[PDB]
């Protein structure tokens, strides 16, 4: 989010803007804080998705020793690079981006977004587009499918996918023969588990609530900031023009000062709230970047870090303002005393 402090507190009033100058650097400090948050959001995405700078091309076939990656890999013969699951993830988070004329010819079409723009409130686009993030996730998965865990430690080294899975089995204390003797059963269990993920999100909503909550919080914060302009804060009116038109400068300045103080405090409250939310998201992004490095580029032995059970491998999927990890785990199912 970006805020024009003078347009929010004083609009186009020269009298109010001259009084606002008496407050010194408050507006400039507020803009520097919001600009720092905006740069941090692009850095968060870069740290989580841009870990490998090699864009491994999607393999033509999505079949590897019977393992089917068709639901998590780019769709074949599709210029866009979004995976079938990613297509759903983007459809489950509901979302500004209004053009110049979209707020001009509005007959009883007043919208909170136009009020945000007319009061100095702007939304900056992300540096990385959704298609660029989908290209990073596709590169990470394609690398994992062919190279293995080597593309995160140096030169990508080709390995047959069954063999890659045999290594991952011996990592969790299971002999490689168990994988080779049961290869068709394991491939079928993996394929069925990925298929259940499709519905698990489609059939049941609230799956992406953590991402929806971040969107809802930001929208609510901006809508609250706009509505604070209707507060008089002890002044005779919330409208600067009503004060300037009815009062002479000495008496008008006292009423304008009450509006400047209340609006500056509303904006200062908003910026502190945004900074608090930005670090909680930075912490989530740093944890996501660590999970990308340890769960996707490697094999984790940390208990419950990459899903519940013995971690074999993980696949990243791009989502609005976030990432969804698909943790593949081995769980003992039947036991004998």
């Amino acid at each position: 989010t970006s805020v024009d402090c003078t347009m929010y507190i004083c609009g186009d009033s020269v009298e109010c803007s001259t009084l606002l100058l008496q407050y010194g650097s408050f507006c400039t400090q507020l803009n520097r804080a919001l600009t720092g948050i905006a740069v941090e959001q692009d850095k968060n995405t870069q740290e989580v998705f841009a870990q490998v700078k090699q864009i491994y091309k999607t393999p033509d076939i999505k079949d590897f020793g019977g393992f089917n990656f068709s639901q998590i890999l780019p769709d074949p013969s599709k210029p866009s690079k979004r995976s079938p699951i990613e297509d759903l993830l983007f459809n489950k988070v509901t979302l500004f981006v209004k053009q110049y004329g979209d707020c001009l010819g509005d007959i009883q079409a007043r919208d909170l977004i136009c009020a945000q723009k007319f009061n100095g409130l702007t939304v900056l686009p992300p540096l990385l587009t959704d298609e660029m993030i989908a290209a990073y996730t596709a590169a990470l998965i394609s690398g994992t499918a062919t190279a293995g865990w080597t593309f995160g430690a140096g030169p990508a080294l080709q390995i047959p996918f069954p063999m890659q899975m045999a290594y991952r089995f011996n990592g969790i204390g299971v002999t490689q023969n168990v994988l080779y003797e049961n290869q068709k059963l394991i491939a079928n269990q993996f394929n069925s588990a990925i298929g259940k993920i499709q519905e698990s999100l489609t059939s049941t909503p609230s799956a992406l609530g953590k991402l929806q909550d971040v969107v809802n919080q930001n929208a609510q914060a901006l809508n609250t900031l706009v509505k604070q302009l209707s507060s008089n804060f002890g002044a005779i009116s919330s409208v600067l023009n009503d004060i300037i038109s009815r009062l002479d400068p000495p008496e008008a300045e006292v009423q304008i000062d009450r509006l400047i103080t209340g609006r500056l405090q509303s904006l200062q409250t908003y910026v502190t709230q945004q900074l608090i939310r930005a670090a909680e998201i930075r912490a989530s992004a740093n944890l996501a970047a660590t999970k990308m490095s340890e769960c996707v580029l490697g094999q984790s032995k940390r208990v419950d870090f990459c899903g519940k059970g013995y971690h074999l491998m993980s696949f990243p999927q791009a989502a609005p303002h976030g990432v969804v990890f698909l943790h593949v785990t081995y769980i003992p199912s039947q036991e004998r005393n």
Partner: protein
């Protein structure tokens, strides 16, 4: 409203109250005044 701004303003409704008082009782024709005129003859609202 500032007297200097009256020539630049327009009003939806204007009411004219007219009466006669003694010179020393003109001060009571104002908000928050206490006196025989302000108490029992003509009172203005505090938000006049």
């Amino acid at each position: 409203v500032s007297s200097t701004k009256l020539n630049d303003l327009c009003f939806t409704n204007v009411y004219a109250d007219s009466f006669v008082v003694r010179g020393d009782e003109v001060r009571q024709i104002a908000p928050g005044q206490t006196g025989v005129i302000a108490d029992y003859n003509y009172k203005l609202p505090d938000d006049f």
